[PDB]
Point group: D2
Chain length 115, copies 4
Protein backbone atom coordinates (compact mmCIF):
# COMPACT_ATOMS: atom_id res chain seq x y z
CA UNK A 1 0.00 0.00 0.00
CA UNK A 2 1.16 3.56 -0.69
CA UNK A 3 -0.29 4.74 2.66
CA UNK A 4 0.17 2.94 6.02
CA UNK A 5 -0.57 4.29 9.53
CA UNK A 6 1.21 2.93 12.61
CA UNK A 7 0.21 3.92 16.13
CA UNK A 8 2.15 3.22 19.34
CA UNK A 9 1.32 3.65 23.04
CA UNK A 10 4.07 5.40 24.99
CA UNK A 11 2.57 4.50 28.42
CA UNK A 12 2.45 0.74 27.93
CA UNK A 13 5.30 0.42 25.38
CA UNK A 14 3.06 -1.40 22.95
CA UNK A 15 1.25 -1.09 19.68
CA UNK A 16 -1.98 0.89 20.03
CA UNK A 17 -4.50 -1.74 18.89
CA UNK A 18 -7.99 -1.13 17.43
CA UNK A 19 -7.51 2.62 16.98
CA UNK A 20 -9.99 4.11 14.44
CA UNK A 21 -8.37 6.07 11.60
CA UNK A 22 -10.25 8.18 9.02
CA UNK A 23 -8.60 9.57 5.88
CA UNK A 24 -9.99 12.51 3.86
CA UNK A 25 -8.87 14.16 0.66
CA UNK A 26 -9.37 17.84 -0.11
CA UNK A 27 -11.81 18.24 -3.03
CA UNK A 28 -11.66 20.90 -5.74
CA UNK A 29 -14.30 22.92 -3.76
CA UNK A 30 -11.99 22.90 -0.67
CA UNK A 31 -14.14 20.50 1.37
CA UNK A 32 -12.78 17.29 2.98
CA UNK A 33 -14.11 14.25 1.13
CA UNK A 34 -14.03 10.86 2.88
CA UNK A 35 -11.20 8.83 1.29
CA UNK A 36 -10.69 5.67 3.42
CA UNK A 37 -10.93 4.42 6.99
CA UNK A 38 -9.94 1.48 9.13
CA UNK A 39 -8.67 0.33 12.55
CA UNK A 40 -5.17 -0.56 13.66
CA UNK A 41 -4.38 -4.26 13.92
CA UNK A 42 -2.64 -6.14 16.76
CA UNK A 43 0.67 -4.75 15.54
CA UNK A 44 -0.69 -1.19 15.75
CA UNK A 45 -0.55 -0.95 11.90
CA UNK A 46 -3.30 -0.15 9.40
CA UNK A 47 -2.64 -1.47 5.90
CA UNK A 48 -4.70 -1.52 2.73
CA UNK A 49 -6.26 1.92 2.96
CA UNK A 50 -5.68 2.71 -0.73
CA UNK A 51 -4.04 1.76 -3.98
CA UNK A 52 -1.34 3.43 -6.10
CA UNK A 53 -3.88 4.44 -8.76
CA UNK A 54 -6.47 5.80 -6.31
CA UNK A 55 -3.91 7.74 -4.24
CA UNK A 56 -3.43 10.57 -6.65
CA UNK A 57 -1.84 13.99 -5.92
CA UNK A 58 -3.74 15.99 -3.34
CA UNK A 59 -3.97 17.24 0.23
CA UNK A 60 -4.87 14.43 2.64
CA UNK A 61 -5.97 14.44 6.26
CA UNK A 62 -5.46 11.42 8.52
CA UNK A 63 -7.53 11.68 11.75
CA UNK A 64 -6.58 9.18 14.42
CA UNK A 65 -9.19 8.66 17.16
CA UNK A 66 -6.83 8.81 20.08
CA UNK A 67 -9.54 9.95 22.55
CA UNK A 68 -11.55 6.70 22.24
CA UNK A 69 -8.33 4.69 22.64
CA UNK A 70 -7.50 6.34 25.99
CA UNK A 71 -11.09 6.40 27.23
CA UNK A 72 -11.33 2.63 26.72
CA UNK A 73 -8.26 2.30 29.04
CA UNK A 74 -9.98 4.48 31.66
CA UNK A 75 -8.07 7.66 30.79
CA UNK A 76 -9.47 11.10 30.00
CA UNK A 77 -6.81 12.38 27.63
CA UNK A 78 -6.06 15.93 26.53
CA UNK A 79 -6.57 15.69 22.75
CA UNK A 80 -9.76 14.95 20.89
CA UNK A 81 -7.78 13.25 18.15
CA UNK A 82 -4.41 13.39 16.38
CA UNK A 83 -4.75 14.88 12.85
CA UNK A 84 -2.02 14.78 10.24
CA UNK A 85 -2.49 16.94 7.10
CA UNK A 86 -0.10 16.74 4.15
CA UNK A 87 0.31 17.18 0.40
CA UNK A 88 0.96 13.81 -1.22
CA UNK A 89 2.60 12.77 -4.47
CA UNK A 90 3.58 16.29 -5.51
CA UNK A 91 6.86 15.06 -7.06
CA UNK A 92 5.36 11.81 -8.29
CA UNK A 93 4.13 8.70 -6.45
CA UNK A 94 5.64 7.95 -3.03
CA UNK A 95 4.92 5.50 -0.20
CA UNK A 96 3.94 7.12 3.12
CA UNK A 97 4.09 5.66 6.61
CA UNK A 98 2.36 7.99 9.07
CA UNK A 99 3.44 7.01 12.61
CA UNK A 100 1.89 8.38 15.80
CA UNK A 101 3.25 7.90 19.35
CA UNK A 102 0.53 8.49 21.96
CA UNK A 103 0.52 9.61 25.60
CA UNK A 104 -2.49 10.96 27.46
CA UNK A 105 -1.33 14.63 27.25
CA UNK A 106 1.05 14.45 24.29
CA UNK A 107 1.48 12.91 20.89
CA UNK A 108 4.08 12.95 18.19
CA UNK A 109 3.68 12.17 14.58
CA UNK A 110 6.31 11.38 11.98
CA UNK A 111 6.24 10.61 8.26
CA UNK A 112 8.60 8.21 6.51
CA UNK A 113 8.34 8.84 2.77
CA UNK A 114 10.02 6.50 0.36
CA UNK A 115 10.41 6.35 -3.42
CA UNK B 1 -3.61 34.26 30.22
CA UNK B 2 -5.42 30.91 30.50
CA UNK B 3 -3.95 29.80 27.14
CA UNK B 4 -0.34 30.13 25.98
CA UNK B 5 1.28 28.47 22.97
CA UNK B 6 5.01 27.74 22.77
CA UNK B 7 6.78 26.53 19.64
CA UNK B 8 10.37 25.12 19.41
CA UNK B 9 12.53 24.26 16.42
CA UNK B 10 14.32 20.91 16.67
CA UNK B 11 16.54 21.58 13.63
CA UNK B 12 18.07 24.85 14.86
CA UNK B 13 17.74 24.24 18.60
CA UNK B 14 15.83 27.47 19.11
CA UNK B 15 12.47 29.01 19.71
CA UNK B 16 10.39 28.98 16.56
CA UNK B 17 9.87 32.76 16.01
CA UNK B 18 7.13 34.49 14.01
CA UNK B 19 5.06 31.35 13.65
CA UNK B 20 1.39 32.11 12.90
CA UNK B 21 -1.07 30.52 15.32
CA UNK B 22 -4.88 30.55 14.96
CA UNK B 23 -7.32 29.48 17.62
CA UNK B 24 -10.88 28.34 16.92
CA UNK B 25 -13.88 27.36 19.00
CA UNK B 26 -16.27 24.68 17.81
CA UNK B 27 -19.68 26.17 17.04
CA UNK B 28 -23.11 24.59 17.65
CA UNK B 29 -23.18 23.49 13.98
CA UNK B 30 -19.74 21.75 14.22
CA UNK B 31 -17.96 24.44 12.22
CA UNK B 32 -14.75 26.05 13.49
CA UNK B 33 -15.26 29.61 14.58
CA UNK B 34 -12.07 31.72 14.57
CA UNK B 35 -11.47 33.16 18.07
CA UNK B 36 -7.93 34.46 18.43
CA UNK B 37 -4.60 34.52 16.63
CA UNK B 38 -1.06 35.76 16.85
CA UNK B 39 2.59 35.17 15.93
CA UNK B 40 5.10 33.61 18.34
CA UNK B 41 7.58 36.00 19.93
CA UNK B 42 11.40 35.88 20.04
CA UNK B 43 11.02 33.33 22.84
CA UNK B 44 8.71 31.11 20.69
CA UNK B 45 5.80 32.07 22.90
CA UNK B 46 2.38 33.49 22.19
CA UNK B 47 0.62 35.13 25.14
CA UNK B 48 -2.65 37.03 25.54
CA UNK B 49 -4.78 34.95 23.16
CA UNK B 50 -7.75 35.08 25.47
CA UNK B 51 -9.06 35.94 28.94
CA UNK B 52 -10.55 33.95 31.81
CA UNK B 53 -14.05 35.29 31.04
CA UNK B 54 -13.95 34.49 27.37
CA UNK B 55 -12.27 31.07 27.59
CA UNK B 56 -15.36 29.08 28.55
CA UNK B 57 -15.83 25.27 28.34
CA UNK B 58 -15.90 24.00 24.79
CA UNK B 59 -13.81 22.29 22.12
CA UNK B 60 -10.90 24.36 20.85
CA UNK B 61 -8.56 24.01 17.89
CA UNK B 62 -5.07 25.55 17.81
CA UNK B 63 -3.63 25.60 14.26
CA UNK B 64 0.09 26.26 13.98
CA UNK B 65 1.35 27.32 10.53
CA UNK B 66 4.37 25.06 10.46
CA UNK B 67 4.56 24.97 6.67
CA UNK B 68 5.14 28.79 6.41
CA UNK B 69 7.83 28.52 9.07
CA UNK B 70 9.80 25.83 7.22
CA UNK B 71 9.29 27.63 3.86
CA UNK B 72 10.78 30.80 5.43
CA UNK B 73 13.86 28.72 6.33
CA UNK B 74 14.25 27.13 2.93
CA UNK B 75 13.50 23.67 4.30
CA UNK B 76 11.00 21.28 2.65
CA UNK B 77 8.29 20.32 5.11
CA UNK B 78 5.88 17.41 5.26
CA UNK B 79 2.79 18.84 7.06
CA UNK B 80 0.44 21.57 5.92
CA UNK B 81 0.16 22.67 9.58
CA UNK B 82 0.06 21.26 13.06
CA UNK B 83 -3.43 21.18 14.64
CA UNK B 84 -4.18 20.61 18.32
CA UNK B 85 -7.82 19.93 19.26
CA UNK B 86 -8.93 19.66 22.89
CA UNK B 87 -11.83 20.12 25.24
CA UNK B 88 -11.23 22.95 27.63
CA UNK B 89 -12.05 23.41 31.27
CA UNK B 90 -14.04 20.16 31.65
CA UNK B 91 -13.44 20.13 35.44
CA UNK B 92 -13.14 23.90 35.89
CA UNK B 93 -10.88 26.67 34.46
CA UNK B 94 -7.24 25.68 33.99
CA UNK B 95 -4.15 27.38 32.62
CA UNK B 96 -3.09 25.64 29.41
CA UNK B 97 0.33 25.71 27.80
CA UNK B 98 0.26 24.05 24.36
CA UNK B 99 3.82 23.29 23.37
CA UNK B 100 4.87 22.11 19.97
CA UNK B 101 8.31 20.82 18.91
CA UNK B 102 8.84 21.06 15.19
CA UNK B 103 10.90 19.13 12.70
CA UNK B 104 10.38 19.14 8.90
CA UNK B 105 8.87 15.65 8.85
CA UNK B 106 7.70 15.29 12.44
CA UNK B 107 6.08 17.27 15.22
CA UNK B 108 5.09 16.63 18.76
CA UNK B 109 2.61 18.51 20.87
CA UNK B 110 2.16 18.43 24.63
CA UNK B 111 -0.24 20.16 26.99
CA UNK B 112 0.87 21.40 30.41
CA UNK B 113 -2.30 22.02 32.39
CA UNK B 114 -1.94 23.70 35.75
CA UNK B 115 -4.24 25.01 38.51
CA UNK C 1 22.40 30.56 34.51
CA UNK C 2 24.01 29.23 31.32
CA UNK C 3 22.37 25.82 31.87
CA UNK C 4 18.75 25.14 32.81
CA UNK C 5 16.93 21.80 32.72
CA UNK C 6 13.16 21.51 32.29
CA UNK C 7 11.21 18.27 32.65
CA UNK C 8 7.54 17.65 31.62
CA UNK C 9 5.23 14.72 32.26
CA UNK C 10 3.27 13.56 29.21
CA UNK C 11 0.98 11.26 31.24
CA UNK C 12 -0.32 13.90 33.68
CA UNK C 13 0.12 16.96 31.45
CA UNK C 14 2.21 18.73 34.06
CA UNK C 15 5.68 19.76 35.04
CA UNK C 16 7.64 16.81 36.35
CA UNK C 17 8.35 17.95 39.96
CA UNK C 18 11.12 16.77 42.30
CA UNK C 19 12.99 14.94 39.57
CA UNK C 20 16.67 14.40 40.46
CA UNK C 21 19.12 15.72 37.86
CA UNK C 22 22.91 15.19 37.92
CA UNK C 23 25.37 16.96 35.70
CA UNK C 24 28.84 15.63 34.85
CA UNK C 25 31.85 16.89 32.95
CA UNK C 26 34.04 14.50 31.00
CA UNK C 27 37.50 14.27 32.56
CA UNK C 28 40.85 13.93 30.74
CA UNK C 29 40.73 10.15 31.39
CA UNK C 30 37.21 9.80 29.85
CA UNK C 31 35.51 9.30 33.20
CA UNK C 32 32.45 11.32 34.20
CA UNK C 33 33.20 13.85 36.88
CA UNK C 34 30.14 14.95 38.89
CA UNK C 35 29.74 18.76 38.65
CA UNK C 36 26.30 19.86 39.77
CA UNK C 37 22.92 18.45 40.74
CA UNK C 38 19.46 19.41 41.88
CA UNK C 39 15.76 18.53 41.89
CA UNK C 40 13.25 20.14 39.52
CA UNK C 41 10.97 22.76 41.03
CA UNK C 42 7.15 23.02 41.01
CA UNK C 43 7.49 24.38 37.47
CA UNK C 44 9.58 21.35 36.36
CA UNK C 45 12.62 23.58 36.13
CA UNK C 46 16.09 23.38 37.60
CA UNK C 47 18.05 26.64 37.69
CA UNK C 48 21.43 27.65 39.10
CA UNK C 49 23.35 24.48 38.22
CA UNK C 50 26.40 26.44 37.20
CA UNK C 51 27.89 29.85 36.39
CA UNK C 52 29.36 31.46 33.28
CA UNK C 53 32.89 31.16 34.70
CA UNK C 54 32.63 27.53 35.62
CA UNK C 55 30.76 26.31 32.52
CA UNK C 56 33.77 26.12 30.20
CA UNK C 57 34.00 24.22 26.86
CA UNK C 58 33.87 20.47 27.30
CA UNK C 59 31.61 17.44 27.03
CA UNK C 60 28.77 17.39 29.55
CA UNK C 61 26.31 14.72 30.63
CA UNK C 62 22.92 15.52 32.17
CA UNK C 63 21.35 12.45 33.85
CA UNK C 64 17.68 12.71 34.69
CA UNK C 65 16.35 10.16 37.22
CA UNK C 66 13.21 9.26 35.33
CA UNK C 67 12.88 5.84 36.95
CA UNK C 68 12.51 7.33 40.49
CA UNK C 69 9.90 9.75 39.17
CA UNK C 70 7.72 7.02 37.65
CA UNK C 71 8.21 4.77 40.74
CA UNK C 72 6.97 7.66 42.93
CA UNK C 73 3.80 7.73 40.78
CA UNK C 74 3.20 4.00 40.87
CA UNK C 75 3.80 3.66 37.14
CA UNK C 76 6.10 0.98 35.65
CA UNK C 77 8.84 2.61 33.60
CA UNK C 78 11.08 1.31 30.84
CA UNK C 79 14.31 3.38 31.22
CA UNK C 80 16.77 3.43 34.08
CA UNK C 81 17.25 7.18 33.43
CA UNK C 82 17.38 9.67 30.62
CA UNK C 83 20.92 10.85 29.72
CA UNK C 84 21.76 13.85 27.55
CA UNK C 85 25.39 14.19 26.40
CA UNK C 86 26.61 17.25 24.50
CA UNK C 87 29.61 19.39 23.78
CA UNK C 88 29.26 22.82 25.27
CA UNK C 89 30.23 26.24 24.04
CA UNK C 90 32.05 25.02 20.89
CA UNK C 91 31.58 28.44 19.20
CA UNK C 92 31.52 30.52 22.38
CA UNK C 93 29.36 30.60 25.58
CA UNK C 94 25.66 29.95 25.03
CA UNK C 95 22.62 29.65 27.27
CA UNK C 96 21.36 26.06 27.18
CA UNK C 97 17.89 24.85 28.07
CA UNK C 98 17.74 21.03 28.11
CA UNK C 99 14.11 20.01 28.00
CA UNK C 100 12.88 16.50 28.49
CA UNK C 101 9.34 15.18 27.93
CA UNK C 102 8.69 11.99 29.81
CA UNK C 103 6.44 9.03 29.25
CA UNK C 104 6.82 5.59 30.94
CA UNK C 105 8.13 3.92 27.78
CA UNK C 106 9.40 6.92 25.82
CA UNK C 107 11.23 10.19 26.30
CA UNK C 108 12.30 13.02 24.12
CA UNK C 109 14.96 15.59 24.78
CA UNK C 110 15.54 18.90 23.03
CA UNK C 111 18.11 21.64 23.44
CA UNK C 112 17.19 25.31 23.07
CA UNK C 113 20.47 27.18 22.64
CA UNK C 114 20.32 30.95 22.66
CA UNK C 115 22.79 33.87 22.53
CA UNK D 1 15.77 -11.42 17.38
CA UNK D 2 14.79 -10.39 20.92
CA UNK D 3 16.42 -6.96 20.43
CA UNK D 4 15.98 -4.72 17.35
CA UNK D 5 16.92 -1.02 16.98
CA UNK D 6 15.18 1.23 14.46
CA UNK D 7 16.35 4.76 13.74
CA UNK D 8 14.49 7.44 11.75
CA UNK D 9 15.47 10.90 10.47
CA UNK D 10 12.90 13.57 11.27
CA UNK D 11 14.47 16.16 8.88
CA UNK D 12 14.36 14.06 5.73
CA UNK D 13 11.40 11.79 6.68
CA UNK D 14 13.45 8.68 6.05
CA UNK D 15 15.16 5.79 7.72
CA UNK D 16 18.51 6.80 9.22
CA UNK D 17 20.83 4.47 7.28
CA UNK D 18 24.29 3.24 8.35
CA UNK D 19 24.02 4.51 11.92
CA UNK D 20 26.48 2.76 14.30
CA UNK D 21 24.87 1.17 17.37
CA UNK D 22 26.78 -0.32 20.34
CA UNK D 23 25.10 -2.42 23.03
CA UNK D 24 26.59 -3.00 26.52
CA UNK D 25 25.45 -5.08 29.46
CA UNK D 26 26.13 -4.17 33.08
CA UNK D 27 28.49 -6.75 34.64
CA UNK D 28 28.39 -7.99 38.23
CA UNK D 29 31.21 -5.47 39.06
CA UNK D 30 29.01 -2.59 37.76
CA UNK D 31 31.09 -1.94 34.63
CA UNK D 32 29.61 -1.84 31.09
CA UNK D 33 30.70 -4.92 29.14
CA UNK D 34 30.49 -4.84 25.33
CA UNK D 35 27.50 -7.00 24.32
CA UNK D 36 26.89 -6.46 20.56
CA UNK D 37 27.17 -3.83 17.85
CA UNK D 38 26.09 -3.15 14.31
CA UNK D 39 24.88 -0.54 11.80
CA UNK D 40 21.38 0.26 10.64
CA UNK D 41 20.39 -1.09 7.23
CA UNK D 42 18.65 0.73 4.35
CA UNK D 43 15.38 0.43 6.25
CA UNK D 44 16.95 2.12 9.31
CA UNK D 45 16.69 -1.21 11.22
CA UNK D 46 19.39 -3.26 12.96
CA UNK D 47 18.53 -6.94 13.36
CA UNK D 48 20.47 -9.92 14.65
CA UNK D 49 22.23 -8.28 17.56
CA UNK D 50 21.56 -11.20 19.93
CA UNK D 51 19.76 -14.43 20.58
CA UNK D 52 17.09 -15.44 23.12
CA UNK D 53 19.59 -17.52 25.11
CA UNK D 54 22.33 -14.88 25.15
CA UNK D 55 19.97 -12.02 26.06
CA UNK D 56 19.56 -12.90 29.68
CA UNK D 57 18.19 -10.64 32.48
CA UNK D 58 20.30 -7.56 33.05
CA UNK D 59 20.72 -3.82 32.58
CA UNK D 60 21.55 -2.95 28.96
CA UNK D 61 22.78 0.22 27.32
CA UNK D 62 22.18 0.94 23.63
CA UNK D 63 24.36 3.83 22.35
CA UNK D 64 23.37 5.17 18.96
CA UNK D 65 26.04 7.25 17.20
CA UNK D 66 23.80 10.07 16.11
CA UNK D 67 26.66 12.63 15.95
CA UNK D 68 28.47 10.80 13.10
CA UNK D 69 25.15 10.45 11.24
CA UNK D 70 24.54 14.22 11.26
CA UNK D 71 28.16 15.16 10.63
CA UNK D 72 28.17 13.02 7.47
CA UNK D 73 25.18 15.13 6.25
CA UNK D 74 27.11 18.34 6.99
CA UNK D 75 25.35 19.07 10.29
CA UNK D 76 26.91 19.80 13.67
CA UNK D 77 24.25 18.40 15.96
CA UNK D 78 23.66 19.03 19.65
CA UNK D 79 24.02 15.51 21.10
CA UNK D 80 27.10 13.33 21.14
CA UNK D 81 24.93 10.24 20.91
CA UNK D 82 21.51 8.91 21.94
CA UNK D 83 21.81 6.39 24.84
CA UNK D 84 18.99 4.16 26.00
CA UNK D 85 19.47 2.28 29.31
CA UNK D 86 16.97 -0.31 30.52
CA UNK D 87 16.46 -3.45 32.60
CA UNK D 88 15.56 -6.35 30.32
CA UNK D 89 13.75 -9.63 30.89
CA UNK D 90 12.94 -8.95 34.54
CA UNK D 91 9.54 -10.70 34.24
CA UNK D 92 10.81 -13.32 31.83
CA UNK D 93 11.92 -13.11 28.18
CA UNK D 94 10.49 -10.30 26.05
CA UNK D 95 11.17 -8.89 22.57
CA UNK D 96 12.35 -5.26 22.51
CA UNK D 97 12.24 -2.76 19.66
CA UNK D 98 14.19 0.37 20.60
CA UNK D 99 13.18 3.16 18.18
CA UNK D 100 14.92 6.54 17.94
CA UNK D 101 13.66 9.58 15.98
CA UNK D 102 16.50 12.02 15.25
CA UNK D 103 16.71 15.78 14.64
CA UNK D 104 19.85 17.86 14.91
CA UNK D 105 18.89 19.37 18.33
CA UNK D 106 16.41 16.77 19.57
CA UNK D 107 15.77 13.07 19.72
CA UNK D 108 13.08 10.82 21.04
CA UNK D 109 13.31 7.22 21.94
CA UNK D 110 10.55 4.70 22.48
CA UNK D 111 10.44 1.02 23.44
CA UNK D 112 7.89 -1.47 22.15
CA UNK D 113 8.05 -4.55 24.36
CA UNK D 114 6.15 -7.66 23.40
CA UNK D 115 5.63 -11.08 24.95
O1 LIG E 1 7.14 19.91 24.60
C1 LIG E 1 8.28 20.10 25.01
C2 LIG E 1 9.27 19.16 24.78
C3 LIG E 1 9.19 18.41 23.62
C4 LIG E 1 10.17 17.46 23.37
C5 LIG E 1 11.21 17.28 24.28
C6 LIG E 1 11.28 18.03 25.44
C7 LIG E 1 10.29 18.97 25.69
C8 LIG E 1 8.67 21.31 25.61
C9 LIG E 1 9.91 21.90 25.39
C10 LIG E 1 10.25 23.11 26.01
C11 LIG E 1 9.32 23.74 26.84
C12 LIG E 1 8.08 23.15 27.04
C13 LIG E 1 7.16 23.76 27.87
C14 LIG E 1 5.92 23.16 28.07
C15 LIG E 1 5.59 21.95 27.46
C16 LIG E 1 6.52 21.33 26.64
C17 LIG E 1 7.75 21.94 26.44
C18 LIG E 1 7.48 24.97 28.49
O2 LIG E 1 6.66 25.53 29.22
N1 LIG E 1 8.69 25.53 28.28
O3 LIG E 1 9.07 26.74 28.87
C19 LIG E 1 9.61 24.96 27.48
O4 LIG E 1 10.68 25.53 27.33
O1 LIG F 1 7.57 7.63 15.14
C1 LIG F 1 8.26 6.79 15.70
C2 LIG F 1 9.00 7.15 16.83
C3 LIG F 1 8.42 8.05 17.72
C4 LIG F 1 9.11 8.47 18.84
C5 LIG F 1 10.39 7.99 19.09
C6 LIG F 1 10.97 7.09 18.19
C7 LIG F 1 10.28 6.67 17.05
C8 LIG F 1 8.27 5.46 15.26
C9 LIG F 1 8.30 4.37 16.13
C10 LIG F 1 8.29 3.06 15.63
C11 LIG F 1 8.23 2.84 14.26
C12 LIG F 1 8.18 3.93 13.40
C13 LIG F 1 8.14 3.71 12.03
C14 LIG F 1 8.08 4.77 11.14
C15 LIG F 1 8.10 6.07 11.63
C16 LIG F 1 8.15 6.31 13.00
C17 LIG F 1 8.21 5.23 13.89
C18 LIG F 1 8.12 2.40 11.56
O2 LIG F 1 8.06 2.19 10.35
N1 LIG F 1 8.16 1.35 12.42
O3 LIG F 1 8.16 0.03 11.90
C19 LIG F 1 8.22 1.54 13.75
O4 LIG F 1 8.26 0.56 14.51
Amino acid sequence: CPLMVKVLDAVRGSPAINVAVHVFRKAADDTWEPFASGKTSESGELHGLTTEEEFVEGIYKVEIDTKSYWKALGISPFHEHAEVVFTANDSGPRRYTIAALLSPYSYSTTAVVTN
